[model samples]
Target: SGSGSTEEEEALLRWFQTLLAKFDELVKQLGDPRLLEEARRLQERLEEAKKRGDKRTIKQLAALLQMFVLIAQIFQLVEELGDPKLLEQAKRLLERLKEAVERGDEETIKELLDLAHMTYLIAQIFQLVEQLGDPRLLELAKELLKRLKEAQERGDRRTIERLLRLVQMTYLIAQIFQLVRQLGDPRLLETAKTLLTLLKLAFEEGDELLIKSLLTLVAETYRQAAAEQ
Candidate 1:
C-alpha cells in the first residue's frame, strides 16, 4: 500500500541487521565463505543509507556493516593467529575425516561434518583471493560456473558433471593458450596462468577425484592440435 515511506525502509534495514547478526554467528559455526561476501555487500548498502542521513535506517544497516567487518576478520584469523601447531591440528582433522569416511566410522563421520564444510569455506576464501579482472577469465568462469550451477540445481549427478566440466575446460583453456603462444599475446599468458593454477590444484589434490589424467589429456590434445596445424 505504501511504497515510499521511511518507516518501511527502516523496517527493512532492521531485518537485514538481524539477518546480519545471524549470518555472523553462522560464519563462526559453519565458516560459510559466502556469508562474509554477503555481509560485505549488505554493509555497503547500509553505509550508503547512513551517508544520506538515514539514522533510523541504520538500526539494521549499522549492525550489518559491523558484521561484515567482523566476518572479514575471521579470514585473517588463520593467518595472524595460526601457528604450525594450529595448522597441524587442522591437518589432523582433515586426515581424521578422510580416515573416517574410508573406514565407515559413524562417530568420526559425525565429527568430521564441520571439517568438510570448513574445507569448502576455505576453498571459497582462496577462490575469492585469487580471482582477477581479466574479461576472458570472467567470461570463462561465468559460463562454467553457470553450467555447474544448473547441474547442481537439477541434481544431475549422473551426468558425470565434473568430468564434463573438465572436458569443457580443456578445450577452452587450450584455445586460450594456443592464441597466446602463437601471437605472443599477454592475454593468453593470463589465461594460461589461471588455467595452470587450476590444473595444479586439481592434480595435487586427488588423482582420482577430478584430475586423474589431465597431463596426458593436455599432451594429447596439444599434439593433435599441432598435427592438424
Candidate 2:
C-alpha cells in the first residue's frame, strides 16, 4: 500500500506535468477525446504507478490527485444529487461528442466536452440549491444572464454562437449552489474546495466565466460555511 501510494503520486505528477505543458493554447479545447482519453489514461497510470512505488511520479501526481478527487466528486454531485434533467442533457451532449469524434472534428468535440463539464456543474449546482439557500448563487445567475445580453450587443461571432448556452449553464449551476448553502450542510465547505479545483481546471482549459464564477463561489461558500460552523 505504501508503494501504491508512492507510485500513484509519481504517475499523477507526470500526468499533470504533461497537462500543464499543454494547458494554455487549448484552454478552450481540452474536451477533445484525445485529451479526455489521455486524462483517463493518466488517471490509470497514476493508480498503477502507485502500486509500483514510483516516488518520482508521485510528487506530480499527488497534486493532481487532490484536484481530480474533487473534480470527480463534483461529477458525483451531479450524478447523485443534481437535477435529473441536467443528466438527461448530458446524455444528449455525449451523443453529439461521439458524432464529432467519429468525424474527427476536434474543435466540435472539444466544445462538446466543455459543454459537458458545464452541464455537470450546472446540474450539480441546481441540486445543491434545492437543499440550501444562498442568494449569492442567484446573483451569479443574474450576472451570467447579463453576459448573454452583452454578448448579443457585441455580436461577437464566436461568443454569439456559444455564449447563450454557456450562460444558461451558469444559471443552472448558480441556482443549485444557492440551495446548497441554505440547507446549511457543513459538507458544502468541502464542496467549495472542489468547486475551486474545478474552476482552476476550467481556467486551465480557457474558461473565463467558469473561473470567475467558481472562484466567487469558493470564497463566498467558504466564508458562509465557516461562519455557521
Candidate 3:
C-alpha cells in the first residue's frame, strides 16, 4: 500500500472525513432490504472498479459503501465505549422498528428511525450550535433541541448513537446518507470524492465522536431543512 506522500489526497480525505462526520438524515422511512443486500455484494466489485478506474461503478459502490461503513463504525464505537446498556437500548428500538414495519406505520416508522439517529448523536448538540454560531445553523440546532425538550424532555444525546447503531446495522444509515445527499448541499458534493479512505481514516483515528456529531449536525440541518420542504 502506498503511504501518505501526497498532500492533495490527504486534504481530500479530510473533506470526506469531516462531511461524513456530519452526515445524518432520516430520509428513509425504512431502508429496502433488497438494496441493502446489494451493498454486501457491491464490496467485492468495488475493489475491481477502483483498479479499472470505472468512475460510475466506483461512484455507485462508494455511495452504497458509506451506509454499511457507518453501521460498521458504530459497532466499533460501542465496543470501545464498553457499555452493555447501549446495546440493550438499541435492542428495544429495534423491536419498536420491527413492530412499525409489521403494521406498515409509515409515521411511526419515521419516528423510530429518527430516534435511532438521535440515540447516537454527539452529546452536546446545543453546545455545538453555540460554538458554531452560524445564522442558519442556529435554527437547525435550536429547533432540534426544542423538539427534544418539547417531547417533555424525553431525550438524551446518546439516543442518536444508539438508534443509528441498530437501524444502520439493521438498515437505516444508507437512507440517512441518501437523504443527506438528496438535500443537495454543495459542500457534500465537494467532499464526496473518496469514502474508502474516509472509512479507513475515520476508524484509524476513532473519530466516531466527530463523525456522530457532524452526522447529527447535518442531519439536524437536513431535518430542519426537511420540514421547510
Candidate 4:
C-alpha cells in the first residue's frame, strides 16, 4: 500500500469538490438552518486546508460535512413519517457522532459528524424569526450572536456548548413571553425579560458552573409556567 502521491491527491480534491456541490443542493432542499451552518463550517475547514496546503484535511472536513448531510436526510424522513422516537434516535446519533469526532476517531470521520451540538441552536433561532412581530426576539438574536463570536475567539468547545444551552434557555424565555402576550399578563413578560438579562450575564461571565446553574433555573421557570397553565 502506497500513501504519498500528488496526482492521487489532486483527483481526491476534485471528487470532494463535486461531492460537496451535490451535498449542498440536497441541504438546500431540506432547508434546515443547522445544515446551512454545517456547510459553512465545511467551507471554513476546507479553506483552512487550502491555506495550509493540505489537500487531505479538506477531505476530512468534507467527510465531517457529509455527517450533517446524512443527519439532514434522517430528519427529512422523520418529518414525513412524523415519529418522535425517530427524532430521538436521530438526536442520539448526533451526540454519539460528535463524541467520535471529539475523540478524533478516523473510522467514523472517514465514513462521515461533531458539528452536532448545533442541532439545537437551529431550534433556538429558527422560531424567533417565525415570530417576526416581536421586537424582543431581534434583541435576543443580536445579543446571542455577540456572545457566540466572543466564545469563538476563545476557541473553547466547552464555552460554546454552554453558550448553546444558554441560547436554548433564551428560546424558552421567548416562548414564555409569547404565552404572556396570549394571556395578556405584564408580570409574566417581566419575568421572562428578567431571566433574559440573567442569561446575558451568564454569557458574559463565561463561567461553566454559573451557566449550568442558570440553565437549571431557566428550565424550572419554563416548567413552572407550564404547570400554571
- lDDT of all the models against the reference? 0.48, 0.49, 0.41, 0.64
Q: Could you give the candidate ranking by TM-score, starting with the highest?
A: 4, 2, 3, 1
Q: How does residue 109 of candidate 3 score in lDDT?
A: 50
Candidate with the greatest lDDT versus the true structure: 4
Residue-wise C-alpha lDDT for candidate 4, range 26-98, written one tens digit per residue = 6788787756776786777777776675866766765666666667666665555454544554555555566
RMSD of 3: 19.0
Decoy 3 TM-score against native: 0.27
Query: What lDDT does model 2 reach?
Result: 0.49
lDDT of 3 by residue, 99-137 (tens): 554576655655544554544442223233344343433
Candidate 2 at residue 65, lDDT? 38
Worst 10 residues of 2 by lDDT: 23-32
Question: On residues 1-229, what C-alpha lDDT tens digit does candidate 2 reach at each position?
Answer: 5334445455556666665444322322434443355356555766675666666546635543333333333345545654455444544554555465457665664444445445544554454445555554544533433443353234344554355444443453454345455666657645754663464355245365665565566556656655655
- Sum up the clashes in candidate 1: 0
Better of 1 and 3 by TM-score: 3
